[PDB]
Write a structure and sequence with these properties.
The structure is cut from a larger assembly and holds 1 copy of chain A (about 230 residues), 5 copies of chain B and 2 copies of chain G (about 120 residues). Chain B is of the alpha+beta class. Chain B contains 4 helices and 9 strands. In chain B, the strands form 2 sheets. In chain B, strands 1, 2, 4, 5 and 6 form a 5-stranded antiparallel β-sheet that branches. The chains are: A alpha+beta (about 230), B alpha+beta (about 250), G mainly beta (about 120). The structure holds a molecule of 7 linked components (NAG-NAG-BMA-MAN-MAN-MAN-MAN), a molecule of 6 linked components (NAG-NAG-BMA-MAN-MAN-MAN), a molecule of 5 linked components (NAG-NAG-BMA-MAN-MAN), the ligand CCCCCCCC/C=C/CCCCCCCC(=O)O[C@H](COC(=O)CCCCCCCCCCCCCCC)COP(=O)(O)OC[C@@H](O)CO, a molecule of 3 linked components (NAG-NAG-BMA) (4 copies), 2-acetamido-2-deoxy-beta-D-glucopyranose and 1 more.
Amino acid sequence: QTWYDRRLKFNSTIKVLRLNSNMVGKIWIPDTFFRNSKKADAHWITTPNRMLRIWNDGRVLYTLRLTIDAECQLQLHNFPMDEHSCPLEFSSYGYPREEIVYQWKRSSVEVGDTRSWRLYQFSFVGLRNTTEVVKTTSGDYVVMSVYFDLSRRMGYFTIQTYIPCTLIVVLSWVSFWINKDAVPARTSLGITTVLTMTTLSTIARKSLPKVSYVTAMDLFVSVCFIFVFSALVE
Amino acid sequence: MDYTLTMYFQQYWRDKRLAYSGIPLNLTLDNRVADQLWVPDTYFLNDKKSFVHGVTVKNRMIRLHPDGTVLYGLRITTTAACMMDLRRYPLDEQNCTLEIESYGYTTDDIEFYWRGGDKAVTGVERIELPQFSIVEHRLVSRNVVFATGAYPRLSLSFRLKRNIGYFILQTYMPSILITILSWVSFWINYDASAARVALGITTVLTMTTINTHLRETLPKIPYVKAIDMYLMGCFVFVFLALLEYA
Amino acid sequence: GNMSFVKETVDKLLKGYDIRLRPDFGGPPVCVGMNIDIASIDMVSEVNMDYTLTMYFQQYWRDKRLAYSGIPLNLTLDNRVADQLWVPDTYFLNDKKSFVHGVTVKNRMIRLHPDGTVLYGLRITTTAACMMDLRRYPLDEQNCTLEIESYGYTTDDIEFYWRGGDKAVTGVERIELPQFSIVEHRLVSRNVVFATGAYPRLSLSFRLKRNIGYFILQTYMPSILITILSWVSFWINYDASAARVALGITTVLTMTTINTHLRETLPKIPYVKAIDMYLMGCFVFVFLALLEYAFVNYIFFGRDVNAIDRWSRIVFPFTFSLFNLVYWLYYV
Amino acid sequence: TGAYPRLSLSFRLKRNIGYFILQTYMPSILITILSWVSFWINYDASAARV
Amino acid sequence: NMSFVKETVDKLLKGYDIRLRPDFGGPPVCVGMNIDIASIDMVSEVNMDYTLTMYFQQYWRDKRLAYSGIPLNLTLDNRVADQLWVPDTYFLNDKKSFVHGVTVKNRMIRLHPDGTVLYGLRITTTAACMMDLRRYPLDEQNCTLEIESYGYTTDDIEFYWRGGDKAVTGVERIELPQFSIVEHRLVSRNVVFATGAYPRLSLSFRLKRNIGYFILQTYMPSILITILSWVSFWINYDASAARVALGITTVLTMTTINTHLRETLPKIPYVKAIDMYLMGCFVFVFLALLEYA
Amino acid sequence: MDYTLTMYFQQYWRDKRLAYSGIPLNLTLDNRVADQLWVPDTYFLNDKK
Amino acid sequence: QVQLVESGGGSLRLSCAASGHTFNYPIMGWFRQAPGKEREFVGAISWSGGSTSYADSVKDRFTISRDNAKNTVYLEMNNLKPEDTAVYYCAAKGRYSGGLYYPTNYDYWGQGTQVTV
Amino acid sequence: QVQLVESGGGSLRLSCAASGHTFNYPIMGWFRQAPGKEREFVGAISWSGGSTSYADSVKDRFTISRDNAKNTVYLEMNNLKPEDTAVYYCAAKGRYSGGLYYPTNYDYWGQGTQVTV
Ligand SMILES: *[C@@H]1O[C@H](CO)[C@@H](O[C@@H]2O[C@H](CO)[C@@H](O[C@@H]3O[C@H](CO[C@H]4O[C@H](CO[C@H]5O[C@H](CO)[C@@H](O)[C@H](O)[C@@H]5O)[C@@H](O)[C@H](O[C@H]5O[C@H](CO)[C@@H](O)[C@H](O)[C@@H]5O)[C@@H]4O)[C@@H](O)[C@H](O[C@H]4O[C@H](CO)[C@@H](O)[C@H](O)[C@@H]4O)[C@@H]3O)[C@H](O)[C@H]2NC(C)=O)[C@H](O)[C@H]1NC(C)=O
Ligand SMILES: *[C@@H]1O[C@H](CO)[C@@H](O[C@@H]2O[C@H](CO)[C@@H](O[C@@H]3O[C@H](CO[C@H]4O[C@H](CO)[C@@H](O)[C@H](O[C@H]5O[C@H](CO)[C@@H](O)[C@H](O)[C@@H]5O)[C@@H]4O)[C@@H](O)[C@H](O[C@H]4O[C@H](CO)[C@@H](O)[C@H](O)[C@@H]4O)[C@@H]3O)[C@H](O)[C@H]2NC(C)=O)[C@H](O)[C@H]1NC(C)=O
Ligand SMILES: *[C@@H]1O[C@H](CO)[C@@H](O[C@@H]2O[C@H](CO)[C@@H](O[C@@H]3O[C@H](CO[C@H]4O[C@H](CO)[C@@H](O)[C@H](O)[C@@H]4O)[C@@H](O)[C@H](O[C@H]4O[C@H](CO)[C@@H](O)[C@H](O)[C@@H]4O)[C@@H]3O)[C@H](O)[C@H]2NC(C)=O)[C@H](O)[C@H]1NC(C)=O
Ligand SMILES: CCCCCCCC/C=C/CCCCCCCC(=O)O[C@H](COC(=O)CCCCCCCCCCCCCCC)COP(=O)(O)OC[C@@H](O)CO
Ligand SMILES: *[C@@H]1O[C@H](CO)[C@@H](O[C@@H]2O[C@H](CO)[C@@H](O[C@@H]3O[C@H](CO)[C@@H](O)[C@H](O)[C@@H]3O)[C@H](O)[C@H]2NC(C)=O)[C@H](O)[C@H]1NC(C)=O
Ligand SMILES: *[C@@H]1O[C@H](CO)[C@@H](O[C@@H]2O[C@H](CO)[C@@H](O[C@@H]3O[C@H](CO)[C@@H](O)[C@H](O)[C@@H]3O)[C@H](O)[C@H]2NC(C)=O)[C@H](O)[C@H]1NC(C)=O
Ligand SMILES: *[C@@H]1O[C@H](CO)[C@@H](O[C@@H]2O[C@H](CO)[C@@H](O[C@@H]3O[C@H](CO)[C@@H](O)[C@H](O)[C@@H]3O)[C@H](O)[C@H]2NC(C)=O)[C@H](O)[C@H]1NC(C)=O
Ligand SMILES: *[C@@H]1O[C@H](CO)[C@@H](O[C@@H]2O[C@H](CO)[C@@H](O[C@@H]3O[C@H](CO)[C@@H](O)[C@H](O)[C@@H]3O)[C@H](O)[C@H]2NC(C)=O)[C@H](O)[C@H]1NC(C)=O
Ligand SMILES: *[C@@H]1O[C@H](CO)[C@@H](O)[C@H](O)[C@H]1NC(C)=O
Ligand SMILES: CCCCCC
C-alpha cells in the first residue's frame, strides 16, 4: 500500500529511509482487511515479514506478506466439469469512502510462474480486478476485489468413477451370455452389480459437500444403476 | 452441536468524557485508541471458542461524535453451542441462538437494547448454506438473575430447516430400491434355493452396511430417530422376505 | 459520585501496591474461598481419556491494602485492573490444555469492597484428564475430577476452602451429555504433602453413568439378528449345500466386521470388556451353527439328519436365550 | 561452536500384548478354522467349498 | 577483570541505533549462513509439504559492536537480540513456521572482539514441496527451502553459504520411514528485477521413496487376487456358481483395493504407475471371467 | 514417532547479585518477577512442540 | 411454547405434565407460595433427570422425579408440616437462563394447585 | 472406598489384599512403624506394571510385587536385621496425591502386622 503523508516529509540528501518494525506501530497505517477471509495470518520468522519505506517527498510504502483462506461459494451443478470465479475482497474497516479511497496501481496484480502454484485439482485461467462502493450500517466503503477464474481437472474422477461405472455395467452385460439354467450365477451377477453401483455412488458423492441437488456424476451413476437393474429384472 | 458464525458486531454508547465541540465532523480514530477508552465487557454466553480477526491490523472500529456518542465495532468469528433435537432427523427443525451478556456489570450499571429495533440484525436473508435453510430469525431482550445480581441479555435466534434432498438420494431411495430388488426372490422358482437364499442374504447384508454408513457423522445419542426407524422397517421387510423362502 | 473522588480513592489504593507480595506477607496465611458455576461439559473422550469443561471460576479473598473508606458501595472496576493487583496462583492440576475466553474482552470480573475484600471471576474452558475403567464397558460408571491447587504457595501462605460448603458448586443441572448422566457430585478439601512442603487442594468430583440405548441400537441388535440369520440355515434342507454354507460364511464375516468396527473406536486397552464377552459368545454361537451344518453334511453323504436338525432348531434359541439371560443378569 | 552440557532422562517401555491377542491373532486363527472346515464338506459341492 | 567486562557491555549497547544496518552508507553487509538439520519429521503428499526442524545460524560483522582488551567471545542472554540489528531473512516457500519457545525462546547471540555477530535460532518450518507423483510409489522428489531477504537488495545485503558445501550439516540425522535422502545441494543466486537484484539461497534435497512397504501393500495382494482368478480354470466348466463367483469376487476385490488406494493421496489429475499396475491386473481378471463366460 | 509428557521442571542455581540480609526466610515471589531475573537458557533438544 | 397442567392436591404426590416445545426448556421446577409472601423455590429437575436440586428447608421431606416420554414431573411430599399449606406451581426454564432459585428466570408457569394440611 | 487386610507376617513374605474401588487408588505402599517411633516409608508399587520405589534403608533387601488378579501386593523380605522389628501397614493412595514418602497422602490403611524376627 502506497500513500502520501505530509507529516513525514524530511529534507536531506538521503532520498529514502527504511524503518524497522518498531516504527510500523508508531505511524498511521491503513486498517485494510479482507472482507471474505475466514482466517488470515501474517508470517513472523526470522523477523516480521513486513517492510516500511518513506521518501523525502512524504510518500510511504508499506508491504506485508499474508496467507489468506478466502471463502468461495461453488455452484457444483456441472461437477466435475465446473468452472468458478473465486473472489478476494478487501477494504478499510473503519474509514468510510469520504475518508479513505483505494485505487488499483497500474499493473496491480502480478502473478509469477503459475507452474509453482499449489493447485493440483484446478487450473488457473485468468484474473480480473474490480472496484465498487458497498453501503453498510456505519457508512459507504470502497471495496476492491480480485476474481480468479478456476477450472476443475477431469483426470481423477474420470479414472475413479466413470471408467469403473462403465466396466461394472459391462460386467452386468456379461450375464446375458450365460446359460438360462445357471440361476445362482446370473442372480449373483445382477445382485453384485447393483451392490457395486451403490458402493460407487457413495464413494463418488462423499467427495463433495452435502449439497441437496444432483450433479453430473450422480446422474451418470443413476443411469448406470438403471442399466444394471434393467438387466437384473430382464 | 455447534455453529460457526462470522459477524460485524457494533456497539453504541454515550460518554460525556468524550464530548467535543468546534469540529463539525465525526472523528474516526485509529483502532488502538480503544486501549485508552472504556468499552463494555460484552461477551457471548454460549460461546465455545471465538476470536477477533487480526490482518492486516486488528479488525476494530472506534468512531467518536461531537455529542459524546462512541461507536465501537469488531469483526468476530465465533463457534457457538447449539443443542439439537435429532428425533425427527433428517426431517428436523433446529433453533440455534446466540446469547449476548455483560460479564461484570449488573443492570444497575449497564443496559442493553437492540439498536434499530427488529432490523438490528442484517445479512441473514443473504446467508446460504447447503444443508439448511434459515426459515426465521428473532431478537429478544431480557434481564437474567444470578446470586451476584441481575444482568442484561440479548438473544439472536435462528430457526434452521434441514433440506431433505441429500438423504433422499443417499439413504431413502437406495434402501427402497434394495427392498424392491429383494422382492425379486418371490418371482424366482422355489427349487432354486441357492439363488433365492443368495439374494436374501445379500439384501440383508446390504441393509446392515447402509445402516453402518449412517450414524458415523451423527452423535452418540441414546434415543432412536426417524431415519433409524425407516432403516429398521426396511431391514424387517427384507428379513421377512428371506424368512418367506425359509 | 462526582467521579473524581472515586479516581482519587482508586489511585491511592494503588501507588504503594507491590504485586510481588501476597496479602499479609509474613503474617498468617491468606484464606481464599472458591466457588464454581458450571456452564457445560462438552466432551467425554474414551480415546483421549479426558473431558472438556466450561465454567465460571470465582475466587474471593481479603487484601487490607485495597481497603477504602468514604464510598459506601462496592466498586465494580474494569477487568484490566486485575493486571495491577495480586491474585492467587491457582491452577488445575490434572488439566491438559485450558484457556480464558477473550471475546469481546478478557472475560474477567474484579469487584472490590470497602473492607479490602476482592472478588475475582474468570470464565475458563479446560480439558481435564479422567482415567476411565472400561472393564464393564458399556455398562460402566466413571469418576472424573477437577483438582484445584496453589502452584507456588504452601499452606503457610495460602489456604483454600469452598464458599457455602456443599453449595459452592452450581450449574450441575445444566450438563447435557447425550452419552452420560451425572449421578452425583462431591466437593473435597485437603492438604497434599510434597518435598517442597504441604499445599492446599480442592477437588470437584463427578460420577457419570453411561446410557445404554445407543449400544442396544448399534451393537447388540445386529449381533442378535445375525445369530438368528445363522439359525435360519437349520430350516433349509440338508441337500442345499450352497444355500446352507452361504448363511454361515456371511454370518461369520458380518460378526468379524462388527468386531473390527466396534474395536476401532476405543483406546487400545489390554483387558476384556463386557461387550467383548458378549461378542465372542455370539461369534461362537454362529460358529457352532456352521460346524453343525458341516457335521450333518459329513454324516449323510461323503461319510439321522432330520433328528439332529430338529434338535438343533429347538436347542439353539434356548441356549442363546440362556446365555443372554446369564450375561445381562451378571452385568446388571 | 563448542562443547555444551547435557542431561538425559530415558524410559524403557514394554508393550502389553492382550489387545493384539484379541485384535489380530484370534481372528486369524478362527478364519483358519473356517478354512479347514471345508475339508469335512463333501465333493460335488463346488459352490460351497470354493 | 569482571567489572571491566560488565561496563564494557553497557558501553557497547549504549549509543547503538537498531534502526540502521551496519555500514549504512558503505558497501553491502555480508551475511553468511549455516543450517544444522535436526530432523525432517513429516513429508505429506496430501498437503504436498514437508516439516523441517533446524538450527539456523547467521554470521555478520558490525563495527558498532566492536570491543578490545577482553580476550574472549561474549555470550549474552537471548533477549539482547531485541536491541541489536538483525537481517530480515525469511523463507519464501514456507506455509507455517515458528521459533521454539520452551523454556525460553531458543535463540542465541554471540559477539566477538572484532565485531562479528553470530545469531542462532531453532526453527520448525512447514515448507511446500511440489511432488510429481507420476511414477508413484517409485518416484523421487526434489524438495527445496528458499531463503530470501524481505526488503534489501544486493546493494545493501549479500548472502552466502558459510563454509561452502560444508555449510549445511546434520543430513545424516534425517530418518524418515518411507524416504531416504540421496543427495543435498546448496545454491546461491541473485533474482533480478527492474526494481533491483535481491539475494537468494536454496537448500535442496532429493528424497527417494522406499519400495518394500508398497511391495507388501498393493503389488503382492494384486498378484494374489490374480492367482485366485487363475485357479478358476482348474475348476470344472459345469460348475457355473463356482467359476462365476470366483471371477466376480476377484473383480470386486480389485475394485476394493483400488478404492483403498488413493485413500491418503491428493486427487491428482494424471495416472500413476500404481494405477497402471492395478488397471492391468483388473484387465487380466476381467479377461479371465470373460473367457469363462 | 513421539510421546506427550507433562512435568514440573525445577532449576536450582546461585546468583550472588540476589543475596539479601535482614529477612531471615525464603522469599516465594510472584510468578511475574521472573521477567526481571536471569534464568538458564534450558531447552529440550528432541521436542517438536 | 410449552403449556403445563398440574394435578394432585400421609404423603401427597403432585404431578405436572408439559406439552409443546419442551426441548428448548430443559429445566423444570417446583415453586411454592403461601398468602402474604412471595413464591419460593422448592425444587428443580433437569432434562436427563439425573440431577436434582432442592430448597434448604425441604431436604429429605420432598422428592422430585422425571418421567420422560410421558413428559411429566412428579413431586412426592412426605411427613407434611403445617407450614407446607400453600399453592404449588410448576414452571419451565430455558437452556440459558441462569439461577434455579429465582422465579423471574422461568418463562412459563403452571396453574397453582392448592395444598392444605 | 477400599478395604485392606495384610497377613503372612528370615524370608518373610507379607501379603496385603485389597477389595473395593481399587481403580481409584492405583498406587499401593508399605509403611513401617517401630515400637514407639514415627511411621516411616518402606516401599511403593504402581498400578498395572509394578513400577517400584524404595527407601534408602531397605534397597536391595526388600522387594514389592503386584498380582492384579487376586488384587494383592506381596512384600518379600530378605537379609533381615534386628532393627526390622516393627508393625507393617499397607495403604492406598489416590491418583493425585503427590509424594510417596508421606503417610498423610494415603487414604486407607491396614490394621498392621507385627514382625519380631
Ligand atoms: C428459538 O428458541 C428461543 C429460545 O427458546 C426462543 O426464544 C423465546 O422467544 C420469545 C419470543 O418469541 C421470548 O419471549 C418474549 O420475551 C420478551 C421479553 O420478556 C421479558 O422481559 C420483559 C421486560 O420488558 C422489557 O424487556 C426488554 C428489556 O429487558 C425490552 O423489550 C423492553 O425494555 C421491555 O419493557 C418482561 O416484562 C417479561 O416478563 C415475563 O414475566 C412476567 C411475569 O413476571 C409476565 O407477565 C410476562 O408475560 C413475561 O413472561 C419477560 O421477563 C417479551 O416482551 C415477549 O412478549 C411477548 O408477549 C407479549 C404479550 O404477552 C407481547 O406483547 C410481546 O410483543 C411478545 O409477543 C415474549 O414473552 C422468550 O424469552 C425467548 N426465550 C428465552 C428463553 O428467552 C425463540 O423464539 C425461538 N425461535 C426463533 C426462530 O427465534
Ligand atoms: C470420585 O473419586 C474420588 C477418588 O478418590 C473420590 O475421592 C474421595 O472422596 C472422599 C469423600 O467420600 C474423600 O474423603 C474425605 O476426605 C476428607 C479430607 O480430610 C482430610 O483432612 C482432615 C483435616 O481436615 C484430616 O484429618 C484427614 O485425615 C484423617 O483421615 C485419614 C484417613 O482416614 C487419616 O489417615 C488421618 O490420620 C486423619 O484421621 C484428611 O487428611 C475427610 O475430612 C472426609 O471425612 C469425612 O468422612 C469420614 C468418614 O466417613 C468422617 O469420619 C469425617 O468426619 C468426614 O465426615 C472424607 O474422608 C477422599 O479424600 C477423596 N479422595 C481423594 C484422593 O481426595 C470421590 O469421592 C469420588 N466422587 C464421586 C462423586 O464418586
Ligand atoms: C532441485 O530442483 C532445483 C530446481 O530445478 C535445482 O536447482 C538448480 O540447481 C542447479 C545446480 O544443480 C542450479 O544451477 C547452478 O546455478 C549456479 C548459480 O549461477 C549463478 O551464475 C549464473 C551465471 O551468471 C546465473 O545465471 C545464476 O542466476 C547465478 O547467479 C551456477 O553457478 C551453476 O553453474 C553450473 O555450470 C558451471 C559451468 O557453466 C559450473 O562451473 C558450475 O559448477 C555449475 O555446474 C549452475 O548453473 C540452478 O540455478 C538451480 N535452479 C534453481 C531454480 O534454483 C536443484 O539442484 C535440485 N536439487 C537436487 C538435489 O536435485
Ligand atoms: C434413461 C434413464 C433416464 C433417467 C434420468 C433421470 C433424471 C434424474 C433427474 C431428476 C430430477 C432432477 C431435478 C429435481 C430434483 C433435484 C433438485 C432438488 O433439490 O430436489 C430436492 C429433492 O429431490 C431430490 O433431491 C432428487 C429427486 C429426483 C431423484 C431422481 C432419481 C433418479 C434415478 C435414481 C437411480 C437410483 C440409484 C441412485 C442412487 C445410487 C428438493 O428438496 P429440497 O427442499 O431439500 O431442496 C431445496 C433447495 O433449497 C436445496 O436443494
Ligand atoms: C456524524 O454521524 C452522525 C451519526 O451517524 C450522522 O447523523 C445521522 O445522519 C443521517 C443522514 O443524514 C440521519 O439519517 C436521516 O435522519 C432523518 C431524520 O431522522 C430520517 O428521516 C432519515 O430517514 C435518515 O435516517 C440520521 O438521523 C443522523 N443521526 C441522528 C442521530 O440524527 C451525521 O450526519 C454525521 N455527520 C458528519 C458530518 O459526518
Ligand atoms: C456490596 O457487597 C456486599 C458484599 O457482597 C453486599 O453485602 C451483602 O449484601 C447482601 C444483601 O443485602 C447480604 O445478604 C443479606 O443477609 C441477611 C442475613 O443473612 C439476609 O437476611 C438477607 O436476606 C440478605 O441475604 C449479605 O449478608 C452481604 N454480605 C456481607 C454482609 O458480607 C452489599 O449489599 C453490596 N452493596 C453495598 C452497597 O454495599
Ligand atoms: C572466540 O571466537 C573465535 C572466532 O570464532 C574463536 O576462534 C576461531 O577458533 C577456531 C578454533 O580454535 C580457529 O580454528 C583453527 O583455524 C586454523 C586456521 O584455519 C586451523 O589451522 C586450525 O586447525 C583450527 O581449525 C579459528 O582460526 C579461530 N578464528 C576464526 C576467525 O575462526 C575462539 O576459539 C573463540 N574463543 C576464544 C576464547 O577466543
Ligand atoms: C529457606 O529455604 C531453604 C531451602 O529449602 C531451607 O533449607 C534447608 O533446611 C532444611 C531444614 O532446616 C535442611 O534439612 C536437613 O535435613 C537433613 C535430613 O534430615 C539433615 O541431615 C540435615 O542436617 C538438615 O537438617 C536442608 O538441608 C537445608 N538445605 C539448604 C539450606 O540448602 C530453609 O530452612 C528455609 N528457611 C526457613 C526459615 O524455612
Ligand atoms: C469531586 O471530588 C474532587 C476530588 O479531587 C474535587 O476536586 C471536586 O471538586 C469534587 N466535585 C464535586 C462536584 O463534588
Ligand atoms: C421398527 C418396526 C418396523 C416394522 C416394519 C413392518
